[PDB]
Amino acid sequence: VPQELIEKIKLISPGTELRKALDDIINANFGALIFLVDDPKKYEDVIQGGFWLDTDFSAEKLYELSKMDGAIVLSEDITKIYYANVHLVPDPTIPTGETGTRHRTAERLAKQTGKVVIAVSRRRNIISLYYKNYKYVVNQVDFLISKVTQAISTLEKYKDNFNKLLSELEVLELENRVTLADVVRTLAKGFELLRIVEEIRPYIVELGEEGRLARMQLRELTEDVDDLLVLLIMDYSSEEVEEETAQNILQDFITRREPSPISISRVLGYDVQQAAQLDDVLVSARGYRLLKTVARIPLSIGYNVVRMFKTLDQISKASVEDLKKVEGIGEKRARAISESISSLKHRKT
Amino acid sequence: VPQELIEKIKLISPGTELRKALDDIINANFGALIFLVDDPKKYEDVIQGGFWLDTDFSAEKLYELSKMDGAIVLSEDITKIYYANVHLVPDPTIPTGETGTRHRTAERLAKQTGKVVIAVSRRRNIISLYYKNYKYVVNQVDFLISKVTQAISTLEKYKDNFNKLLSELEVLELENRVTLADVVRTLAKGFELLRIVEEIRPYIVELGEEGRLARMQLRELTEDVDDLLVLLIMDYSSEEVEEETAQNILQDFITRREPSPISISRVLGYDVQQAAQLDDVLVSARGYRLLKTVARIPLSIGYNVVRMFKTLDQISKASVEDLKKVEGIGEKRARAISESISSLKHRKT
Amino acid sequence: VPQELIEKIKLISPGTELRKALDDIINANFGALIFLVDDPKKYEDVIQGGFWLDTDFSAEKLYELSKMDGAIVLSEDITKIYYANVHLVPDPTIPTGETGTRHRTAERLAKQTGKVVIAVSRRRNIISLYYKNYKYVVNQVDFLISKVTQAISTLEKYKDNFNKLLSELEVLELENRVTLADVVRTLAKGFELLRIVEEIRPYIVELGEEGRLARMQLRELTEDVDDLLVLLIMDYSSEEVEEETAQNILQDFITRREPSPISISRVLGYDVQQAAQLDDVLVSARGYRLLKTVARIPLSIGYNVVRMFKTLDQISKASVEDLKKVEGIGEKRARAISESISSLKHRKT
Amino acid sequence: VPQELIEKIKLISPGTELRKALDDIINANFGALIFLVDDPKKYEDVIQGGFWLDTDFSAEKLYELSKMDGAIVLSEDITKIYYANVHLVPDPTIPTGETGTRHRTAERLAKQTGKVVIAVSRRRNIISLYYKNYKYVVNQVDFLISKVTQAISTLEKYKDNFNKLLSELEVLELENRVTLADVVRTLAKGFELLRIVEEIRPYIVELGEEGRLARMQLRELTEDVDDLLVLLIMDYSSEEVEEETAQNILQDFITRREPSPISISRVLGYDVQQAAQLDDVLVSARGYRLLKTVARIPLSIGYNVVRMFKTLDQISKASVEDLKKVEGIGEKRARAISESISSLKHRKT
Numbered sequence A, B, C, D: 001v002p003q004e005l006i007e008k009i010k011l012i013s014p015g016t017e018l019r020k021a022l023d024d025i026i027n028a029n030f031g032a033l034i035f036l037v038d039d040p041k042k043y044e045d046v047i048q049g050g051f052w053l054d055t056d057f058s059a060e061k062l063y064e065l066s067k068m069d070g071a072i073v074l075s076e077d078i079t080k081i082y083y084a085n086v087h088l089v090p091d092p093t094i095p096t097g098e099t100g101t102r103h104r105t106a107e108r109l110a111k112q113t114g115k116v117v118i119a120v121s122r123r124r125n126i127i128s129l130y131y132k133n134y135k136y137v138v139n140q141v142d143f144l145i146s147k148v149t150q151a152i153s154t155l156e157k158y159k160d161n162f163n164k165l166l167s168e169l170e171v172l173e174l175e176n177r178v179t180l181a182d183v184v185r186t187l188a189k190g191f192e193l194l195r196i197v198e199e200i201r202p203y204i205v206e207l208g209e210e211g212r213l214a215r216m217q218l219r220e221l222t223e224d225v226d227d228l229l230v231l232l233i234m235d236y237s238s239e240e241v242e243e244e245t246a247q248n249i250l251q252d253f254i255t256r257r258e259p260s261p262i263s264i265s266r267v268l269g270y271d272v273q274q275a276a277q278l279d280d281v282l283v284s285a286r287g288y289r290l291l292k293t294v295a296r297i298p299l300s301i302g303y304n305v306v307r308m309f310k311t312l313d314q315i316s317k318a319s320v321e322d323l324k325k326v327e328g329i330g331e332k333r334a335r336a337i338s339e340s341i342s343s344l345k346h347r348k349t
């Protein structure tokens, strides 16, 4: 769903004075054909008859005007009602798949002016918005909640396995028995989890005011996952990688590329051609994820640490004195990295 | 939703005969305009024609009367039905955004008398309640259960993270590696979680008898959250703070101030102006939470233990003989404090 | 809700050929007045006119017959349709609160014959069943699911805290630091949890075929809780108690008595009058719950173990040889009790 | 639901133009009687009058035609609309339980030609699909999402218990204190959980494009359950069993036999006739699950380790040098088996 159309969907999202009107029209089983224009004068050729109101907009007035047939003309910002009961005559040569005069009129006029034309059918409790060559049929509020509510439950399930794979990876990390398969499997889950968040966004928008709780649940469930995936890529890619580079690696698998096991490892710098070999590829964490997350050391300074010790396993074996040898690591930091790592070793493993 | 309006909302909440009648009227597609007065003689200027019934109220009777057009006058305690089919004539000078005579009349009368006036649209399946300058549109039962269900799940997600943070803080507390970030990070979550409860509160009232399960769940999810937050504050404020004093800090952040990371660290007496400075501020718990929570020690008595040992870290290394010196701590209290804390140590770390 | 009425509710539960009919009648907005009799001849005085069909019952035929007005007379087992379009004339002296002839007729006739009379109102999408002095209005399927679904979520929340209190009690048990408050608090939660299961039963029935998944969720959530509460009572009551006695103690708090802290301990044999003293009452588990549950020793044989060692703490301190001194405990059992206890001590604490 | 019928159900599943049209017809309260044939000339005896359109299908066109009375004839691939307003005349000798001419005609025609015939009642919001001797009443989208949502939660509860049991078994496995009850108790739960998936499968198809989230969740909840069960069987059957052989045992219990405690212990080769005898039967895992699952060792290679060490308990005490003797186990595999198992030991026990 194009961001171009999503802004127009926002005009009839729950919470807007326009949807309040459109809801009353549906509940009362009336029909409607609304033309949203920033200037009536520009479209005098397609607007015939009806009455010239040119009055302040109001959900109550639009509903009231929807009792007469014909089309109603509103300003684009929904602050003025220009006409009512007008006969819209769009270009008859414009292709339309619709079968009824009300919707054939709506599609054609939308395609012709580039303006938003809303058509509410009398026989069906449906709102159809026509923008460019787009046609968005408004889902019923309850359905959306029910759809969004499912998306969330699917997210929670994914988040669950993600956490499990992550806590298992942490154990192999602290024990230095991690394999490419372990890393990749974990990235795949995170990526899919974030892909589902993206595929759900449009519905969170069609919900307007009513998508509040959904945004909150989503944010609580995906809070640190991206920072976590970026750190994973930084720690497990074949050759040294920059924070920013990993972030592009994250976005790439969230949109373009498919998070396939063999595809991921490839993008991480490993030349594998069969998902089985992954189990046979040993790999060691640089220590970025643990240094930042646990040790609380800024990535900038973490670079200096990894620069000198190379891997988490080696960082794990340095004294509080060897750690201070690093630019950026004083006495406190040394304690940090050291205690937080020895603490995780005495618990997780 | 002003508490003043909620009291009037209770009148048409699921479970009440009035709503029972109103639901009937909705199902049968009838309209209505109910005027609730404590004394008809006090409004004989706005009540006209109709029939004087002066009889006992009943969901069944109200429904029957709803088949007639016009208004129905009920007693404020919903025990009497005074008139039916009356013509209401309120102050015409009162501005109204409504467009239909039923609603125009409903809002003007309410705003003129301060009395409750309920309007049910004949064309829409909607109940509207006018009190002072308020207009409450009664939501369909299913929608609330839905919306309240979602809020519960939102609380759930928040409470989960709350738990992850609190348990992570505990681990740190036991290892005496706590920072200001860790503490503040936990309060914010706890604070947000209670704010959400607050915002849901009204809908739980708009469910009448149908908000029993929701009340039960909310209680199970928030049970000891407030106490826990009150305790976390007493242990981590810059300078010793009294119980009651911490509670106001708790309320303050639920309603007034926003649980913003830096705003919280300031309210606790830690002059900071940058959230990044937190990961560098070290802090030691007083021991109040653990003393009271795990060791079942009264806060007044806790004051002494903390006064003599200064930090949880020290209370943690205290011998039973050491703990006995403290005024109020007997031989049992000492074992209690001693054994309960060591038990955690061995388990959590 | 009396079991007497619940059997009659089963006649129109989803899944029954009768509800299938009643659903079609609602969806088609028709009305109906169904009289369920085991013999028409007995009620010839109240059944006038209409047509004598005396034919096989069928959801399709009843729906079809519901298009004519008047009442339809069916056999009690829903296998025959005796009449249609009949005029039912019940006792006019029987008190009724109804206001319409269709429902005044239904109530009166139900009160008079003791038979089931179903009234479906044309204006409202509602099914009203009248049995004795009972009147059950059928809830809409979707609502029930939504109600039952909430009940379940409330159960899961309770089950959650229950498990937490239980795993915390297990720790104090293995460490022998349990107090009356610890035991009681845990019983209270379990009792309430089971009380909610009972208060939900009627809805699980009104759901018929559609309550399948709900029964399954309930059973998965409450599976071992009762056996667990019985064992708790056996281990923590002041004076030795029999399995059966505890079971009556369980049922009592699930129906009659209220699971109040001070009420429970009292029933457990402790003379307390203030919920605060509970924290000051030390108590030791006999070892029944652990011996049966973990050690797998039949309660009958567990009695012999408790008879000789008295408490779990002492059972916890016996050698594999001292344990064999008990009637019923050979070499294997000794290993059992011993290893399972030492295993829990090396993990939970 | 025979797979034969599900293939025809796919035709009116959310996402298809036909259902799109059918939903329109439902909303506008129109009725319909659609006959799907691959060749009209083959049924010119049952098609009468009406209009010969022979045009391209379209959800919009079908809807338009639904305003006319009579039947509509479509091609089986839903790309052509042959007739509209036709009078269908099927074999009158075919018995039918239907009472209205539309449905009587619908069932007789379907049963006479083997072709699909869809009837939409004008009075009820219902779609009915007749194939052979089958009658599928299309459930309203919201209800399925609901019912499927509940089944997912049921799976959730089952999967939870599954997890509790499996992890409890693991603990026992590591301590070599496993009984036959513990093993069988776990399989039953695993078995029930997959049976439920099976029973839900059809509804997930009746959701068309709207069963994507449900498919995703189901996959996240059952992902490795089957493999896990296949492995638990290979480790605990009375006598060594081959992989494929265990899978049939798995299928057998999902479809045929019931996961009854005693029935399962018999299928595994443990002659028992009383569930109480189980708590007394001791059993030692082969080590296949742990070898393959945790130690990432192929089952074919696992055969050797198990062949030489007999039990997991022994594999567990095996040195790296010991593990190297086994054909197929190199220096890495040994460390893998050795380190991975010890890691569990230290963590789980």
Ligand SMILES: Nc1ncnc2c1ncn2[C@@H]1O[C@H](COP(=O)(O)OP(=O)(O)OP(=O)(O)O)C[C@H]1O
Pocket: A031, A033, A069, A070, A071, A086, A087, A088, A089, A100, A101, A102, A103, A105, A120, A121, A122, A123, A124
């Ligand atoms: N060019 C137009 N300008 C203004 N109004 C139009 C125009 N074309 C059609 N209409 C409106 O169409 C209305 C009739 O509805 P109709 O076109 O039959 O579809 P409907 O009523 O929405 O039901 P369905 O479209 O079949 O679901 C009446 C008329 O005011």
Ligand SMILES: Nc1ncnc2c1ncn2[C@@H]1O[C@H](COP(=O)(O)OP(=O)(O)OP(=O)(O)O)C[C@H]1O
Pocket: A028, B031, B033, B069, B070, B071, B086, B087, B088, B089, B100, B101, B102, B103, B105, B120, B121, B122, B123, B124
């Ligand atoms: N002052 C009044 N006193 C008594 N009844 C009134 C008064 N004003 C309006 N009504 C009632 O209004 C009823 C007509 O309905 P109306 O006012 O058009 O709104 P509606 O029928 O509910 O539809 P909408 O609310 O516009 O969607 C008929 C009349 O009994």
Ligand SMILES: Nc1ncnc2c1ncn2[C@@H]1O[C@H](COP(=O)(O)OP(=O)(O)OP(=O)(O)O)C[C@H]1O
Pocket: C031, C033, C069, C070, C071, C086, C087, C088, C089, C100, C101, C102, C103, C105, C120, C121, C122, C123, C124
């Ligand atoms: N004694 C009776 N025997 C048979 N049918 C009766 C009898 N009394 C009333 N009825 C039926 O009542 C039907 C009329 O419906 P009515 O009594 O007005 O309530 P309704 O139609 O269900 O709507 P509401 O009850 O107001 O929700 C018509 C008639 O067949």
Ligand SMILES: Nc1ncnc2c1ncn2[C@@H]1O[C@H](COP(=O)(O)OP(=O)(O)OP(=O)(O)O)C[C@H]1O
Pocket: C028, D031, D033, D069, D070, D071, D086, D087, D088, D089, D100, D101, D102, D103, D105, D120, D121, D122, D123, D124
């Ligand atoms: N043989 C047939 N060929 C074409 N149309 C038929 C045939 N038989 C019945 N119909 C259609 O039946 C329609 C009338 O509806 P009807 O058969 O009474 O059921 P309905 O209207 O759907 O209500 P119910 O199904 O009884 O709840 C009108 C007619 O076009």
